[PDB]
């Protein structure tokens, strides 16, 4: 049926979405494409019809009727760093001063992304496309037969043609599991253009509990997809920390070990259940490696327990000041510090010896990492993750967790926030835990899982149950190790630390003119705004291509420096331009956006040049932060 259209569509898939095309070419559907009484094409299977009589008209009327209502749209309000704050404040102030105001919801159809939960035979598509003209089109269709039969009914070539320059603009997701649908949708938005989800059209093609739930999930998920890009000033701090950490002096670099060490390791967090296990840790410290995670050092040292390693994840003066207070009160003895390359440079002074690992997904990683083998996965979100992943990377396999509680044992309102969720406890029952602690818990289980079955992890903490660990009362702990074995295994660890000289610093730093790259990138974004002011989707496509595109090659230092700030600015103006009234004065607001976007890029340009000129001279993170903050 419609053989010319079928052939023409099959050709387009084979050309522009080949794997899907190949699958369509050999597919033998179980369902039947039939002409119903209304003369519309329909899908029959065991006497059941997808559309049934008047089904086409119903679905088409829904697409027509839902062009403007907020119920069938993502509505993400815009609240961010100081630069975007200034930008946003200015565009709004200039607009309101000029007599413009902002509707709660847009009065226009539009939005960058369109999400179809279900395709069916695609009767809705022509209408939705004409209304919104989306740049990103994401179709979820659990039943491959429907896509196959849609070759008879949809004009697929103009859709597939959008993949020519950028294949991420059209995604067809053939999945039946809610979990997979959710992951793929998130990934489709995230990879195409995560930041402008505002006013995304949502449409369910046919009735399905699966499709309905996926839409609800996506609506909750949509706001979070474009989060997490680092802001200019934080990237300045990360790179300054790393610069200072590697410039001078003795330090070493962490390296993954191919072989296993048999000395057990005790990973110690700051959970209060530690007081039950202090004596056991003390009685065994001679034959186990003690990894102290952040503030855990206080309780170990006050009880005469010497950490072998002290872990630090966080950047910033506050984590440093906490560590310094512990050093001042007890001293750190012979402990080696294992920290992220972005920890406060003054942390070095507190320790005889310092080893760095390279924390990924930051400007400091791209600029200073000598390679993937010197970084850690799942080193976050907290320092307990850092110690666990560091231990596994170094070769330790028998692990004991202490003070890794990540919650407290179970001991008509006005202020009604929920502070805690009930979770199964390591020693059974229930413990109350917060969201940050569950992420920490999940990262621990996940890293430990990647080293099983060689990894054997015991949790002696009276807190939450952690996957891939076995509960163990510290009274039942019996080790097979000796002090000699421990000394042997520390010698192996120590021998694996690659020393860091100035050679490494210069190799990394001198290979590119950093401020020049950044200023060049900024110039290209300014120019993009001038060339595409007024054309939301094209402008966003152009900025995304310049700033994101993480898959093809890793992000450059320049991209890490500016993408978070510029994309958040884009998110802000994109939200307000769709809502500006009077509608016939929209171009005036576009001019405001263009001009302020330039002023923002100018301020960023000057900050970058000033920052690189003085990167060495800043006495601390707080000096740097105070000065960019006070930028007049
Ligand atoms: Cl081995
Ligand atoms: Cl309980």
Automatic annotation (TrEMBL):
Pfam families per UniProt: Maf_C (PF20156), Maf_flag10_N (PF20157), MptE-like (PF01973)
Protein name: DUF115 domain-containing protein
Domain 6-hydroxymethylpterin diphosphokinase MptE-like: 249-409
Coiled coil: none
Organism field: Paramagnetospirillum magneticum (strain ATCC 700264 / AMB-1)
Organism taxonomic ancestry: Bacteria, Pseudomonadati, Pseudomonadota, Alphaproteobacteria, Rhodospirillales
Domain Glycosyltransferase Maf N-terminal: 10-225
UniProt-listed InterPro entries: Maf_C, Maf_N, MptE-like
Domain Flagellin glycosyltransferase Maf helical bundle per the UniProt entry, residue ranges: 511-632
Top-rank taxon, per record: Bacteria
């Amino acid at each position: 049926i419609n053989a010319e259209l079928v052939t023409a569509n099959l050709e387009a898939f084979l050309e522009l979405m080949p794997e899907m095309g190949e699958r369509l070419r050999v597919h033998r559907p179980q369902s039947n494409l039939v002409v119903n009484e209304d003369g519309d094409l329909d899908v029959e299977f065991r006497g059941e019809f997808l559309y049934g009589p008047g089904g086409r008209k119903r679905i088409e009327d829904m697409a027509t009727r839902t062009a403007l209502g907020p119920d069938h749209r993502i509505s993400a309000a815009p609240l961010v760093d100081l630069i975007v704050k200034r930008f946003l404040y200015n565009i709004l102030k200039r607009a309101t001063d000029s007599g413009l105001s902002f509707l709660q919801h847009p009065e226009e159809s539009g939005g960058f992304h369109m999400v179809c939960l279900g395709l069916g035979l695609g009767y809705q598509l022509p209408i939705l496309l004409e209304q919104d003209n989306p740049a990103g089109i994401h179709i979820v269709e659990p039943n491959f037969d429907f896509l196959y039969h849609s070759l008879s009914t949809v004009d697929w070539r103009p859709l597939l043609e959008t993949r020519r320059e950028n294949p991420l603009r059209l995604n067809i997701i053939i999945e039946e599991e809610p979990g997979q649908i959710a992951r793929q949708l998130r990934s489709a938005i995230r990879c195409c253009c995560p930041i402008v989800v505002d006013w995304t059209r949502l449409f369910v093609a046919y009735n399905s509990p699966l499709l309905t739930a996926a839409m609800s999930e996506f609506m909750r998920d949509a706001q979070l997809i474009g989060i997490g890009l680092g802001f200019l000033h934080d990237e300045m701090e990360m790179t300054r920390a790393s610069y200072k950490n590697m410039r001078d002096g003795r330090y070493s670099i962490l390296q993954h070990s191919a072989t296993q060490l048999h000395t057990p390791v005790f990973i110690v967090g700051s959970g209060p259940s530690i007081d039950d296990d202090i004596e056991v840790i003390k009685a065994n410290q001679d034959r186990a490696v003690i990894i102290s995670c952040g503030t855990a050092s206080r309780v170990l040292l006050a009880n005469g327990i010497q950490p072998d390693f002290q872990m630090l994840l966080e950047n910033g003066a506050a984590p440093y000041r906490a560590l310094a207070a512990v050093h001042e009160e007890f001293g750190f003895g012979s402990a080696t510090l294992i920290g992220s390359n972005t920890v406060d440079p003054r942390v070095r002074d507190l320790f005889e010896d310092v080893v760095y690992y390279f924390r990924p997904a930051l400007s400091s990683y791209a600029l200073f990492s000598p390679g993937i083998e010197y970084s850690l996965d799942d080193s976050g979100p907290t320092v307990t993750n850092t110690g666990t992943t560091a231990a596994l990377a170094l070769g330790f396999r028998e692990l004991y967790l202490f003070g890794v509680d990540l919650g407290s044992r179970n001991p008509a309102m006005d202020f009604d926030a929920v502070f805690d969720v009930r979770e199964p406890g390591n020693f059974g029952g229930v413990v109350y835990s917060e969201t940050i602690m569950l992420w920490t818990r999940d990262a621990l289980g996940r890293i430990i899982g990647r080293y099983r079955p060689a990894a054997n992890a015991f949790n002696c903490s009276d807190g939450v149950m952690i996957e891939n660990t076995r509960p163990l009362s510290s009274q039942s702990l019996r080790l097979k190790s000796t002090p000699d074995m421990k000394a042997k295994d520390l010698a192996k660890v120590r021998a694996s630390f690659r020393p860091g000289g100035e050679e490494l610093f210069h190799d990394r730093w001198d290979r590119e003119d950093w401020p020049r790259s950044i200023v060049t990138l900024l110039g290209e974004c300014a120019q993009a705004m001038d060339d595409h002011v007024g054309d939301s989707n094209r402008l966003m496509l152009v900025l995304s291509e310049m700033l994101l595109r993480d898959y093809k090659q890793p992000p450059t230092v320049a991209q890490f420096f500016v993408r978070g700030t510029l994309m958040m600015a884009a998110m802000c103006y994109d939200y307000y331009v769709k809502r500006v009234t009077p509608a016939d004065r929209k171009a005036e607001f576009w001019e405001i956006i263009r001009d302020e976007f330039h002023q923002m890029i100018r301020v960023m340009t000057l900050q970058v040049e000033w920052y690189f000129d003085n990167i060495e001279a800043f006495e601390s993170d707080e000096e740097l932060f105070d000065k960019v903050t006070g930028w007049d």
